[PDB]
Amino acid sequence: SSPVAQKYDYILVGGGTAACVLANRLSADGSKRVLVLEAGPDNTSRDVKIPAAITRLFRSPLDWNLFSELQEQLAERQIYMARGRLLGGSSATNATLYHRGAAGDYDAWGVEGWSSEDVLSWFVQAETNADFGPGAYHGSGGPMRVENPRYTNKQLHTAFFKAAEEVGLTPNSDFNDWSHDHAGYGTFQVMQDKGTRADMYRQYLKPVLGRRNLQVLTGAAVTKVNIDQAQALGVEFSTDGPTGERLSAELAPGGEVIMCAGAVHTPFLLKHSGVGPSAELKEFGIPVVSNLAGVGQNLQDQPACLTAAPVKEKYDGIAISDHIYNEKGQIRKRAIASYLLGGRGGLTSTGCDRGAFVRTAGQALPDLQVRFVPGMALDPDGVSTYVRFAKFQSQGLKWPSGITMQLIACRPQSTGSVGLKSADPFAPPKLSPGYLTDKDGADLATLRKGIHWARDVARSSALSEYLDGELFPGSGVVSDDQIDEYIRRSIHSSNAITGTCKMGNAGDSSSVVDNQLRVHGVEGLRVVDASVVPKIPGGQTGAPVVMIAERAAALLTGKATIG
Numbered sequence: 001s002s003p004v005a006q007k008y009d010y011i012l013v014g015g016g017t018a019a020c021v022l023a024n025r026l027s028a029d030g031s032k033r034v035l036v037l038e039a040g041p042d043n044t045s046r047d048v049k050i051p052a053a054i055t056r057l058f059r060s061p062l063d064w065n066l067f068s069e070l071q072e073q074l075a076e077r078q079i080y081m082a083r084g085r086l087l088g089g090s091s092a093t094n095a096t097l098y099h100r101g102a103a104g105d106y107d108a109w110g111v112e113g114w115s116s117e118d119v120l121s122w123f124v125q126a127e128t129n130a131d132f133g134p135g136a137y138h139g140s141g142g143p144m145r146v147e148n149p150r151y152t153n154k155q156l157h158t159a160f161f162k163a164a165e166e167v168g169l170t171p172n173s174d175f176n177d178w179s180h181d182h183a184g185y186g187t188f189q190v191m192q193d194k195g196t197r198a199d200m201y202r203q204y205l206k207p208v209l210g211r212r213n214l215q216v217l218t219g220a221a222v223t224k225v226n227i228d229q230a231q232a233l234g235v236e237f238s239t240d241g242p243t244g245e246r247l248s249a250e251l252a253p254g255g256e257v258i259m260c261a262g263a264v265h266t267p268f269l270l271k272h273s274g275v276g277p278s279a280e281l282k283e284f285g286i287p288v289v290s291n292l293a294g295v296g297q298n299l300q301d302q303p304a305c306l307t308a309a310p311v312k313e314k315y316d317g318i319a320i321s322d323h324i325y326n327e328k329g330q331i332r333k334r335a336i337a338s339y340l341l342g343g344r345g346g347l348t349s350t351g352c353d354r355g356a357f358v359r360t361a362g363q364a365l366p367d368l369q370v371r372f373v374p375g376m377a378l379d380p381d382g383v384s385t386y387v388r389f390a391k392f393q394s395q396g397l398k399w400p401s402g403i404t405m406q407l408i409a410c411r412p413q414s415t416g417s418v419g420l421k422s423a424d425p426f427a428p429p430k431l432s433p434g435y436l437t438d439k440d441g442a443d444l445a446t447l448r449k450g451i452h453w454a455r456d457v458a459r460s461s462a463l464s465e466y467l468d469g470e471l472f473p474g475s476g477v478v479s480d481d482q483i484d485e486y487i488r489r490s491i492h493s494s495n496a497i498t499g500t501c502k503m504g505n506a507g508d509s510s511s512v513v514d515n516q517l518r519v520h521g522v523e524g525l526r527v528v529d530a531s532v533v534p535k536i537p538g539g540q541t542g543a544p545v546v547m548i549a550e551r552a553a554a555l556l557t558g559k560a561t562i563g
């Protein structure tokens with residue numbers, strides 16, 4: 001009723017990060033009728049604009065409220081896995097930190113035409129960095145905005161960097177400079193524009209909403225991809241929900257269907273769409289169009305645990321939580337005024353934007369990312385505490401002052417899986433994050449040795465001056481067996497999720513798409529989102545997505561080639 005006898009050259013399933021890039025590039029001439037179906041609403045919320053209000057998007061209408069299956073290995077828990085639900089997708093709901101990983105992360109991909117020398121100029125082509133002059137590793141004209149965080153906790157960030165130095169770490173002045181080693185302490189840059197969040201809706205989609213060849217519908221949840229027997233021919237969606245009409249959007253001659261539904265819902269939509277392993281599809285009575293055993297496998301996610309600790313009494317009031325809430329739980333009016341008049345203060349802060357990369361056991365690249373936060377966690381599950389901080393507003397209590405150190409296996413060997421649990425295209429997928437299931441216990445050994453490392457740093461003379469003890473895991477967690485058991489019951493997601501539709505050389509029976517992002521054994525079907533990532537890079541995964549979506553877009557329209 002909105003695609004009415006109209007045909008599209010590109011149908012984009014999803015209105016997310018990679019989608020917001022692609023629409024911009026693909027719609028940029030005038031010869032292409034681009035479509036962009038987003039299940040979520042429009043991007044118009046003030047909680048999305050303000051970095052600190054990310055504590056309000058967890059478990060919110062703007063989130064898919066996805067929970068994993070029972071994880072036997074994780075004290076028989078379901079694991080909440082945040083995912084954005086709106087135009088801009090997860091770039092609207094994320095912690096905004098800007099990472100590329102290391103040059104060695106893309107060379108180990110092994111795929112042709114995507115070595116570190118291949119991907120570097122797409123990273124830089126997409127960037128306007130406020131804090132690095134232009135060079136081989138930093139851009140000045142690209143659509144993304146990147147800056148150093150404009151909040152600084154003068155006492156507790158500097159004691160963190162001293163601590164790190166006291167325990168023998170060396171400073172990294174730029175984690176995205178591939179000409180030195182990835183490891184060390186320092187500040188993470190954030191995807192922000194003078195303290196306002198610069199999601200991919202803001203930086204890409206929004207400035208081209210006036211193009212007449214660009215059609216973007218929200219509320220439009222796609223149910224499958226029409227594949228006449230192989231050649232895709234459209235998608236089927238509903239503008240109302242599970243209780244709505246089953247519309248259809250047609251492709252024009254030589255029109256392609258781009259999957260941008262994320263690493264959770266794209267393999268999900270692929271299995272419903274007849275693309276998956278026959279055995280899993282035969283179980284729900286789904287016909288098999290292409291039998292690729294890679295769909296839904298290889299789910300990679302970076303698992304986190306934390307330690308938290310209160311400061312001494314003499315330092316009550318110097319936490320970022322003291323700069324955001326007052327002693328009665330109301331937002332400080334001064335924090336609001338700095339933010340609006342000047343883009344400064346606690347409200348520009350996703351909190352976890354200072355840290356380190358450490359090698360725990362002399363590995364080739366760092367296995368451990370530390371994120372330091374000068375607020376105190378109140379639950380061992382970091383995400384939970386963030387939700388608790390949102391609900392804490394105006395309750396009447398003082399949030400206690402202290403620091404949190406989050407620890408993350410950033411190059412984790414464990415993999416997961418996404419699958420079908422119901423024939424209902426509107427049901428939550430079968431989702432198993434798979435943490436701590438690698439055969440060598442390597443992920444577990446990183447997080448445990450992260451717990452020893454964070455207590456070392458908390459013991460340094462620079463940090464012990466501020467701290468009074470340790471709340472999590474607590475003084476009763478001393479043995480190695482007690483630390484792994486603390487990790488198992490508290491392990492949360494640092495929210496990455498890659499690899500569920502991986503690319504690889506021709507002759508890879510494990511792969512889903514090829515190095516040109518088109519899935520094997522289907523015509524005019526391609527995937528351009530975090531799914532294709534064959535191997536998660538040491539770092540938050542949003543920037544590599546944009547590079548994947550830019551490269552894909554010039555490739556489509558003739559500006560670049562791969563291999």
Ligand SMILES: Cc1cc2nc3c(=O)[nH]c(=O)nc-3n(C[C@H](O)[C@H](O)[C@H](O)COP(=O)(O)OP(=O)(O)OC[C@H]3O[C@@H](n4cnc5c(N)ncnc54)[C@H](O)[C@@H]3O)c2cc1C
Binds near residue numbers: 040
């Ligand atoms: C809480 C959180 C914090 C993060 N923090 C950081 C960080 O600090 N730095 C960083 O670099 N990365 C971060 N990430 C990761 C980064 O946000 C994601 O890796 C990236 O945005 C994924 O982009 P994408 O294009 O793969 O998918 P998404 O941005 O997830 O887009 C997929 C879209 O598909 C839509 N969709 C799903 N099903 C359907 C359907 N049936 N019909 C229509 N549309 C559908 C979804 O609503 C969504 O908008 C974070 C992730 C989260 C969740």
